[PDB]
Design a protein around this ligand. Structure first.
Ligand SMILES: [Zn+2]
Ligand SMILES: [Zn+2]
Ligand SMILES: [Zn+2]
Ligand SMILES: [Zn+2]
Ligand SMILES: [Zn+2]
Ligand SMILES: [Zn+2]
Ligand SMILES: [Zn+2]
Lengths: 75, 75, 574, 428, 86, 143
């Protein structure tokens, strides 16, 4: 239903989700609401990276769960 | 600036001076009021001795009392 | 048909008892009968009569259930309460909200009894009571703010009257239920801590301490009262004081007043003071101040013992001032005065030689303590000898230093500068002391007179003339007058530049007066030298022993004067 | 009158006390923050006789400190404008009427340029600003030509963006950058909270919010911590589940701490937010096992020895509300049994709050005691901590493990406990 | 002459002579009683102790200290007393 | 928005002139965004090296992607296809550099070593140039 993200700065905004949605849509909402481009995001939930193919509910996404956002950098 | 001069006994020497006068000239002015040599005349205002400060570098403004101390060895 | 017989009893015997030898029909009958009867009677005769209707009906049904029916009585009473008060509590509580005024406790007790049965039917009682107490208290305090902000006794009386009226009201109406006692306590705490009467801040502790000082001191009010009434008033004051939030301010003011007292020995009873200390501890005041007060009392006891010992030891030898006319007090710095700032005053000869004696006596027994002499808390009595009569009067140290400037000139006039030189005091303290010694509250005849008359202490010039009044009378010829009222305990910081200037002037002028007399008279001994210096400087200041000794040494150093060989008190001019 | 001017003569001009933890803050909304940012600009614009856009563009670089800006202006009013990335440097290098991006001869009613005088046509600059805004930069837009550090004024950017959504995004990003650069202003960590805290000196003190009740160090913005050195408590929190994954496969940015990862390849790592360059080998700039368990036994023992106290005083905050409720129930019971009135029984709540504050401070005093020293200051700090611990256990026995109560003893012990807590918090 | 002197009252304040005005073990100034003697309502009977290296402490405080560590709380010299207070 | 015109103009410009070290760049049958490249240097004198070219959308403002398909021994080139060129990277890219300049810069990069995506190659090339003249010599005909 609704989930939180712990941004790198520290602020925790709230964004709407779907019962089972692709990570691409979530990254699109993050980039349209916070700024970081989708290819520069690494979302971690319960110590497991969220692949671009697997749906949210596979990694046990549910109501009132906190995620984290980490910047992607290349050498 | 109207100033007053006091002696050891307590005589109140009165003199009216312009705001811009000279220390040596003002010292000599007391001679007409009472005959004393120029050298055997020292003036003290608020602690340290008064040097020959032209008029108001010592902040002698308004009605102030200056102690007319004489010379010690000569007299 | 069994319920038909019981129905007629309401509208106008042993059969029913055997009939029971099941109840839901009875409960339904009662519920329907009340649902059909109650609203009509309410709309006919108002809430004030519906209350008594409900009370009588409840008691009647309890008795009827006990006589006809039997745990079932509990359920029947519950459903009767639901039918009568549970569904009409909104109207009854509206009447409560619109009723609490105009002192109608007789209906209120019935209302409280009716509403205690239903759960959660009591909070509006508390809300209305709190609102009434707060509004009435604020309105009453603001209705007379002119004559209450200045007098402490009137303020205390008003607060106590409000408390007594509200407590009597809650006892008479609410019948002393602790919940409503809590409500009135919260409302009273809200009322007492307000600043709307002030600000055209935190001023209540000051007034309370002032009233306590009025009671404990030797005021006329303390004269027209016995000990029991004093204790009762103190307990009432403590009851009011228990409801404050700023207690440190009150304790500070009380400590100041207990310094004024217990340093001037103007108290009415020491046992009451000890009891007040204990009661203040019991009420729950901060521990630091209470411990400090206990330390103060112990310190004055030890000081009395030490003064007795000093008088006993020093009575064998007779100094300039007799040993039976001097009192000494040594007190802890932390409990009384924590500031070690220096105060610059010229001091009389008689009490200047007293300091080393006390210091040696203290150092004899105790090892490792310093002494700081506090010149703002020292009192005494001096004798005035006028052309009319001989008078005695009470002065402080500053007033004494000011007044001894006319001993060697007791017919002449002194200016402001000459007072700043002889008394060796700053401008503010000198102005305050001069205003005290010239302008006192009533004093139809004053001690000192000044020619350029003004209307403010600050409006003094440097040429103001001061003279001693030679027609001052108390037309009596002997009596005592007091000039010490609320002795100051704190003074502003003192700059050392003025003291340095005064010391320089004194040194140089003593040099002048010691070389001039030697020039005019070639040879002179030591004692007559001191007498001649005192005589020659009667219009500047009174010389002291250490300064003149240092000046003689300086003259020997710079060859202005020369020593002799016949004795050790003769000087020969070089 | 004997009672006139009594307020002046009291306490020898010194009384009460001073709180070692005071910090003045006013909580402003979004509109008030925008107004404050606008107001701190017109003064500089009027003094320096320049436009508003250049005014805020030079303000952003120097962290909105007006006095330093004025002093540096009167020192070197040319290096002032050069440093803030406004005017071209005198050490730059240079066909006519030809756009070098889309490569077509263009008329004169276009070909807009900055003070650098590099000509690019109005058909261009638009995709550039659009790509930059979409990527999420507000103050990073610069001249397209190579080696031109000039920054674009906003009055030059607004007419270029095509639609309204892009303008809204640019305004939001610009506001975020402005509130980040300013030194008296800071955002509020938490949920959606449009509250900005304004202070008078930038320091590390406890603050609060007026809409969500959040508490944080004004520098780290994570959690209040009085004795510790902010970075030190960050280190303690780091060295103490997503935690293992983060601590194993991430790192922290040197200048502005940001959790980042290495996608793969190369060792030159560049920050994409603060432009700082560092190494993913052992950090740093570019101007450059027998008995192991026996050795680390002491370290692990010390860490657990401090962590047990940390964890106990952390669980106290958790089981705080139950203690408050127990105190309330005891008070209500004694009131109902008519053993006094309500006003006589609210020093227990004050004692409870005192214990809470003492436990919180004694919690945060341990990381400081671990990362401190090996000297006498160490030898005395945890001794004073032990004294406070003894007083806390004594008062807890007297308030929650006892029935008979005496007001004087409890007030005296409360005073003693406050004195010892101040003793610990002294060096702050 | 006029203005003789008949009876005088004198007030003096006493404090310890020390360069340092704090215990360095507790936040109590030297002129005030220590926390333990306030808690026990002692009749002001704890004095100050001077060490060889000129340190001032409460007798109660350092009497509790000496059991654990036999050195100053400021330096680390061997503590032998020089002058007890009273 | 206007990337296709840019790519057609650049194709016309490349078709007009001709270069020696850079052989030619292809288009893969009207892909219009996937391009094939070929270079020849002069210790890699003999060989027709092959390049893969990808043009992202809004090309002039977004740098392209560059990967070699033919294996080569270079301290500045990764094992598979990663080449370190600041111009190619977004750090030092400007909307004025063409694909021709990028390719000639890559050729100049192949010309010399820049002492790093492979520590072993850099270490070998630092101590002496013999290994970089033998294993790099025998690197284009095979693997
Ligand atoms: Zn440019
Ligand atoms: Zn163009
Ligand atoms: Zn907030
Ligand atoms: Zn911090
Ligand atoms: Zn101590
Ligand atoms: Zn003690
Ligand atoms: Zn020592």
């Amino acid at each position: 239903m609704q989930i939180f993200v712990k941004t790198l700065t520290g602020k925790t905004i709230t964004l709407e989700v779907e019962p089972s949605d692709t990570i691409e849509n979530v990254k699109a909402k993050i980039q349209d609401k916070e700024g970081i481009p989708p290819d520069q995001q690494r979302l971690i939930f319960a110590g497991k990276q969220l692949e671009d193919g697997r749906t949210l509910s596979d990694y046990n996404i549910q109501k009132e769960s906190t995620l984290h956002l980490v910047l992607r950098l290349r050498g | 600036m109207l100033i007053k001069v006091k002696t050891l006994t307590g005589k109140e020497i009165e003199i009216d001076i312009e705001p811009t006068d000279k220390v040596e000239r003002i010292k000599e002015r007391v001679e007409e009021k009472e005959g004393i040599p120029p050298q055997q005349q020292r003036l003290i205002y608020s602690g340290k001795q008064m040097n020959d400060k032209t008029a108001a570098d010592y902040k002698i403004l308004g009605g102030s009392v200056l102690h007319l101390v004489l010379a010690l060895r000569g007299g | 048909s069994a319920m038909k017989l019981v129905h007629a009893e309401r509208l106008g015997s042993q059969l029913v008892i055997g009939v029971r030898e099941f109840e839901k029909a009875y409960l339904d009958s009662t519920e329907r009968f009340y649902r059909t009867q109650a609203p009509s009677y309410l709309q006919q005769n108002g809430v004030q009569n519906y209350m008594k209707y409900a009370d009588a009906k409840l008691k009647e049904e309890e008795k009827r259930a006990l006589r006809y029916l039997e745990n079932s009585v509990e359920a029947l009473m519950e459903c009767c309460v639901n039918a009568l008060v549970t569904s009409f509590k909104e109207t009854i509580l509206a009447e409560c909200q619109g009723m609490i005024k105009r002192n109608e406790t007789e209906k209120l007790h019935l209302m409280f009894s009716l509403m205690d049965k239903v759960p959660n039917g009591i909070e509006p009682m508390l809300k209305d009571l709190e609102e009434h107490i707060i509004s009435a208290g604020l309105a009453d305090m603001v209705a007379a703010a002119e004559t209450i902000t200045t007098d402490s006794e009137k303020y205390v009386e008003q607060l106590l009257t409000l408390f007594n009226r509200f407590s009597k009201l809650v006892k008479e109406a609410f019948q002393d239920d602790p919940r409503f006692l809590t409500a009135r306590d919260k409302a009273y705490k809200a009322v007492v801590n307000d600043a709307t009467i002030f600000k055209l801040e935190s001023k209540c502790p000051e007034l309370l301490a002032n009233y306590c000082d009025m009671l404990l001191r030797k005021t006329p009010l303390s004269k027209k009262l016995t000990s029991e009434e004093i204790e009762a008033k103190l307990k009432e004051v403590l009851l009011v004081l228990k409801y404050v939030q700023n207690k440190d301010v009150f304790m500070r003011y009380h400590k100041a007043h207990l310094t004024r007292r217990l340093i001037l020995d103007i108290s009415a009873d020491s046992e009451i003071e000890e009891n007040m200390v204990e009661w203040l501890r019991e009420v729950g005041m901060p521990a630091d101040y209470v411990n400090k007060l206990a330390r103060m009392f112990q310190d004055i006891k030890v000081s009395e013992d030490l003064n007795q010992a000093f008088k006993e030891m020093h009575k064998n030898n007779k100094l300039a001032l007799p040993a039976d006319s001097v009192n000494i007090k040594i007190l802890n710095a932390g409990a009384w005065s924590r500031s070690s700032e220096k105060v610059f005053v010229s001091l009389p000869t008689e009490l200047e030689d007293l300091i080393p004696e006390v210091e040696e006596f203290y150092k004899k027994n105790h090892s490792g303590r310093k002494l700081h002499w506090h010149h703002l808390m020292s009192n005494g009595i001096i004798t005035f000898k006028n052309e009319v009569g001989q008078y005695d009067l009470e002065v402080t140290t500053f007033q004494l230093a000011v007044l001894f400037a006319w001993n060697q000139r007791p017919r002449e006039k002194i200016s402001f500068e000459n007072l700043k030189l002889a008394t060796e005091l700053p401008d503010a303290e000198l102005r305050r002391t001069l205003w005290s010694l010239v302008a006192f509250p009533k004093l139809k005849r004053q001690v000192l007179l000044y020619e350029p008359q003004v209307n403010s202490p600050k409006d003094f010039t440097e040429g103001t003339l001061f003279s001693v009044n030679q027609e001052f009378s108390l037309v009596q010829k002997r009596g005592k007058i007091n000039l010490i009222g609320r002795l100051q305990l704190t003074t502003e910081r003192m700059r050392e530049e003025e003291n340095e200037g005064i010391v320089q002037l004194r040194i140089l002028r003593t040099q002048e007066a010691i070389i001039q007399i030697m020039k005019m008279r070639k040879k002179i001994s030591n004692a007559q030298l001191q007498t001649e210096l005192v005589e020659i400087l009667k219009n500047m200041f009174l010389p002291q022993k250490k300064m003149i000794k240092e000046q003689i040494e300086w003259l020997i150093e710079h060859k202005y004067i020369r020593r002799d060989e016949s004795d050790i008190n003769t000087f020969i001019y070089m | 009158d004997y009672y006139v001017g009594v307020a002046s003569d009291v306490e020898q001009q010194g009384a009460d006390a001073f709180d070692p933890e005071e910090y003045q803050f006013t909580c402003l909304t979004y509109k008030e923050s925008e107004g404050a940012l606008n107001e701190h600009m017109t003064s500089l614009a009027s003094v320096l006789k320049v436009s508003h856009s250049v005014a805020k563009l030079i303000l952003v670089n120097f962290h909105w400190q007006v006095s330093e800006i004025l002093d540096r202006y009167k020192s070197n009013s040319a290096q002032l404008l050069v440093e803030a990335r406004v005017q071209p440097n005198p050490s730059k290098h240079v066909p006519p009427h030809h756009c070098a991006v889309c490569m077509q001869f263009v008329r004169k009613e276009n070909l807009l340029s900055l003070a650098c005088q590099h000509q690019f046509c109005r058909s261009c600059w638009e995709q550039h600003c659009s790509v930059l805004v979409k990527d999420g930069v507000g103050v990073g837009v610069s001249c397209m030509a190579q080696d031109c550090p000039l920054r674009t004024p906003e009055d030059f950017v607004f007419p270029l963006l095509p639609n309204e959504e892009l303008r809204e995004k640019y305004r939001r990003y610009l506001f975020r950058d402005y509130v980040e650069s300013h030194y008296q202003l800071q955002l509020c960590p938490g949920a959606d909270c449009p509250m900005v805290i304004r202070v008078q000196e930038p320091r590390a003190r406890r603050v609060q919010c007026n809409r969500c009740n959040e508490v944080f160090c004004f520098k780290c913005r994570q959690m209040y911590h009085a004795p510790t050195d902010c970075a030190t408590i960050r280190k303690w929190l780091t060295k103490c589940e997503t935690a293992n994954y983060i601590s194993a496969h991430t790192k922290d940015c040197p200048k502005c701490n940001i959790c980042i990862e290495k996608n793969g390849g190369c060792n030159h790592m560049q920050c994409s937010k603060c432009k700082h360059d560092f190494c993913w080998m052992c950090l740093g700039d570019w101007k450059t096992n027998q008995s192991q368990q026996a050795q680390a036994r002491e370290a692990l023992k010390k860490y657990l020895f401090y962590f047990e106290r940390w964890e106990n005083h952390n669980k106290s905050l958790q089981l705080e509300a139950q203690t408050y409720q127990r105190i309330h129930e005891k008070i209500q019971e004694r009131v109902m049994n008519n053993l006094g009135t309500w006003i006589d029984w609210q020093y227990l709540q004050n004692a409870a709050k005192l214990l809470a504050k003492c436990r919180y401070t004694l919690q945060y005093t341990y990381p400081y005691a671990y990362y401190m020293e090996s000297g006498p200051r160490k030898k005395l700090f945890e001794y004073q901590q032990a004294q406070l611990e003894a007083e806390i256990e004594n008062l807890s026995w007297k308030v929650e493990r006892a029935d008979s109560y005496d007001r004087g003893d409890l007030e005296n012990q409360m005073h003693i406990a406050e004195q010892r807590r101040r003793t610990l918090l002294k060096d702050f | 002459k006029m203005f003789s002197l008949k009876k005088w009252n004198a007030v003096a304040m006493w404090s310890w002579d020390v360069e340092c005005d704090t215990c360095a073990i507790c936040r109590v100034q030297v002129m005030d009683a220590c926390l333990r003697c306030q808690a026990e309502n002692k009749q002001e009977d704890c004095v100050v102790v001077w060490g060889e290296c000129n340190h001032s402490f409460h007798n109660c405080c350092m009497s509790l200290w000496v059991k654990q560590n036999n050195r100053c709380p400021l330096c680390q010299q061997d503590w032998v007393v020089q002058r007890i207070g009273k | 928005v206007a990337a296709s015109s840019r790519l057609m103009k650049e194709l016309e410009e490349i078709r007009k002139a001709g270069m020696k070290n850079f052989r030619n760049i292809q288009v893969d049958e009207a892909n219009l965004l996937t391009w094939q490249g070929l270079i020849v240097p002069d210790p890699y004198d003999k060989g027709a090296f092959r390049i893969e070219i990808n043009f992202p959308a809004e090309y002039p403002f977004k740098p392209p992607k560059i990967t070699f398909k033919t294996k080569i021994y270079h301290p500045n080139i990764d094992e598979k296809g990663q080449v370190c060129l600041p111009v190619i990277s977004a750090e030092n890219w400007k909307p004025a550099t063409k694909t021709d300049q990028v390719i000639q810069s890559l050729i100049a990069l192949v010309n010399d070593p820049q002492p790093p995506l492979r520590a072993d190659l850099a270490e070998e090339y630092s101590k002496d140039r013999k290994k970089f003249a033998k294993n790099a010599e025998e690197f284009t005909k095979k693997y």
